[PDB]
Symmetry: D2
Subunit: 114 residues, 4 copies
């Protein structure tokens, strides 16, 4: 899997478990087409969203449903969700780890590309 | 002004000057309508995007053109841009400061609501 | 004032008010000598820690009492406190803003130097 | 190993490899006694610093030599190093992952405790 998402909880000091993640790919008409989706595991990870065959060059949007996550904790979050938009494989296939660190009013995101 | 954006550069240790910021508001048909735009000042700040009369409850998207910013520095960035999506004034008018700290492969964003 | 500290709360989406901040300077014998201290205001800011006459080149440590801050909110924090260690004015006097964004198990810190 | 350190590079979008890490434990006389040290691997990770037998309750300081790391990249960093100070095993043995995300003028740190 060339696309992995990892999500952490900065309030509890633990992985953000069962966070919904939706991935979209920009279509020719500049629309976001659904690409893959999943929920993070107990380790706050989501693997197996794609295959390198299917993961072609393009602009992808990784949307993390942070709102639902905090609501389930009884916390009222600021953001509707966290989005990470990036061009991928523009120079051939690469492995992308998109990480997010969550707090009710803040998130940090980083990408490790190899 | 009930909405202010501040953008900092984590690589140079300075405000991110002249970063284009586009603000949209979700329309009834679930589309993003253009709302306000501008460029950050020499202090990395963007004020006067709205008025509290015009700033009604709704879901707003603040889009920060980070890609152009790094390209201008000769650095190749990961993200197409940074987006902050949030519901505003759902409980009456508030002052929102949306801050972003930028790095080529990472960004952190926080909201200070008062 | 050539040294300012700003502290924000990522859980409440507000400035971190009344956070104790202690600044030290490395002495010849490699010990931390007390330099300045204070508490953040209602805006999460702490100014007037020094004067540019007194603020000479050296290694300074800004210590932020985050533990007390979270305890006062009834939250159990991970860190004893946050420390920022940096060499200052090594190239003549500059204005330093040290900012920190706090969460129970995490903190981000940036410097804006001008 | 109950203590793991992971360090990432926000400028290159990769793990921060070969970063020196020194861990200290607060002694009875309130002095920092050397506890363990190592360098991060190609994956930006440092494991095997201790054993759960040796990792007793106490206040520990994890110091990350960020300055040397950036200097080797020809970048001049703001911080001397990044320090993470925390009380550990105060409620019995736990596994601690201390993560840091680095930029020349900024770092973020989080702890995942299990
Ligand atoms: O901790 C992981 O295992 C991790 C994995 C991939 C990328 C980043 C990772 N950690 C981390 C540590 C601090 C801050 C952030 C960020 F906010 F950028 F997502 C991520
Ligand atoms: O530094 C400011 O003046 C600031 C203003 C409003 C909100 C946050 C601010 N500072 C700050 C300091 C560290 C990290 C971040 C964040 F990444 F969240 F944007 C923001």
């Amino acid at each position: 899997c060339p696309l992995m998402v990892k999500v952490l909880d900065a309030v509890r000091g633990s992985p953000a478990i069962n966070v919904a993640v939706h991935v979209f790919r920009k279509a020719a008409d500049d629309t976001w087409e659904p690409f893959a989706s999943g929920k993070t595991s107990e380790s706050g990870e989501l693997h197996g969203l794609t295959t390198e065959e299917e993961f072609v060059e393009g602009i992808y949007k990784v949307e993390i449903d942070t709102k639902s996550y905090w609501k389930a904790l009884g916390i009222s979050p600021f953001h509707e969700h966290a989005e990470v938009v990036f061009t991928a494989n523009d120079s051939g296939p690469r492995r992308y780890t998109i990480a997010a660190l969550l707090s009710p009013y803040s998130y940090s995101t980083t990408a490790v590309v190899t």
